[PDB]
């Protein structure tokens, strides 16, 4: 029973394809932790996005509907926009 991540996510690459890919490395000490992924339809193809290491990047694929893709939570949530 994992718990949400309290750290930030640093972006590395965003591409296209009818879906988006996002590569993010994690800054934190509380790993392994669930990735707070939200869209503001908006769906996450990646099942159970989880960090398990600070050094290791994570691949996240999302199917957005213009809205922001918010990976993270709190004062340092990574906010992006797409169409």
């Amino acid at each position, epitope marked *: 029973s994992y718990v949400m991540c309290t750290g930030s996510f640093k972006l590395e690459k965003e591409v296209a394809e009818g879906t988006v890919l996002v590569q993010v490395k994690y800054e934190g*000490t509380d790993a392994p932790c669930k990735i707070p992924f939200s869209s503001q339809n908006g769906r996450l193809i990646t099942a159970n996005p989880i960090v398990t290491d600070k050094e290791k990047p994570v691949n996240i694929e999302a199917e957005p509907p213009e809205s922001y893709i918010v990976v993270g939570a709190g004062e340092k949530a990574l906010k992006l926009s797409w169409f």
Partner: antibody
Amino acid sequence: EVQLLESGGGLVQPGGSLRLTCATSGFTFRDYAMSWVRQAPGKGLEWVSSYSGIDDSTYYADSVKGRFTISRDNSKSTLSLHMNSLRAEDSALYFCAKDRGPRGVGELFDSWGQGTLVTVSS
Amino acid sequence: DIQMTQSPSTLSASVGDRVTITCRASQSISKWLAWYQQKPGKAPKLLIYTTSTLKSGVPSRFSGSGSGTEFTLTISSLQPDDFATYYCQHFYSVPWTFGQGTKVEIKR
């Protein structure tokens, strides 16, 4: 407008239990992460626990892990701290804290209560 | 865990002088540092977050700089209601930890 009132503190013997409650009024309790931070006498601040604002994620300081549990009531808009196996070092002023923004994990302590004292001693 | 250390522990300075406090982190916390002020008898008050962003209502004589491992909190012109103990807290990830505190004294 944001006001927090902690209650439930007092004297309790070692190995005993206690339960603090934090009553809130000026904000949507649902959307915010809520925290417990303690200050022992003549010392600094020590974060105790955090209850996330996006799910039921709970976070605990190492010294406290396994002994306290932070619970949330979004009906009465109250934040409870259940303390068990209390130790001498747990004696302190217990503050209830509010995160600066909604839908967070308790990064900041934007609005504090006036505290509730906890003395652990036989 | 990340352990913060403040410098100096106690500080004496007269009203109107420009005074500085330092926070060092055991490891890089990027820009995820906040500064709280605590008056005697009262609860802490968040002054700064994300290194340099001022909380609403805080006078502009306060200003936070630094990044990575070293951070500084600066008071431009010390004032009467500015004597207190200042803590710094990283919010890089849990556990959240504070510095030991810097109690600033009004010289007279």
